[PDB]
Design a protein around this ligand. Structure first.
Ligand SMILES: O=S(=O)(O)CCCSc1nn(-c2ccccc2)c(=S)s1
Length: 133
């Protein structure tokens, strides 16, 4: 009953500061423009200890499966090859990505009927809000 309140199908409904976040991460102009238009659907499921998070959009379809606390390799939508570790901290999924000596953290939390995604790179935060589909 690990992550129950995250499981389901979610649709992006608002974004703030995502272009600046992507700049900070190193995403180039054309990818930022196209990626910034996307309205992904996020599909989260759990089977035993394995959590799966899929993102489907006109830009890219991605999928990660993982066990909490256990590092895995991830190719991000912007084509970074990162080493990721996801843990639960007080009910928040905390996802750290490491690559080329850099780090970014993505937090996912349930707030009311929303799933709120906060992406941080150095001093720059983007907030992405999802509703149930
Ligand atoms: O906020 S969420 O889309 O849930 C997590 C965001 C973390 S990083 C990047 N996401 N994308 C991205 C992913 C899907 C669709 C459009 C853009 C980049 S391009 S870089």
């Amino acid at each position: 009953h690990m992550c129950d309140a995250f499981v389901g199908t979610w649709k992006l409904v608002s974004s703030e500061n995502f272009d600046d976040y992507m700049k900070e991460v190193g995403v180039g102009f054309a990818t930022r423009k196209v990626a910034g238009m996307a309205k992904p659907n996020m599909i989260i499921s759990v089977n035993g200890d394995v959590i799966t998070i899929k993102s489907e959009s006109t830009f890219k379809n991605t999928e990660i499966s993982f066990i909490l606390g256990q590092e895995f390799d991830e190719v991000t939508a912007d084509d970074r090859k990162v080493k990721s570790t996801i843990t639960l901290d007080g009910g928040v999924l905390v996802h750290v990505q490491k690559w080329d000596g850099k780090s970014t953290t993505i937090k996912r939390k349930r707030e009311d009927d929303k799933l709120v995604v906060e992406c941080v790179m150095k001093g720059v935060t983007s907030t992405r809000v999802y509703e149930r589909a």
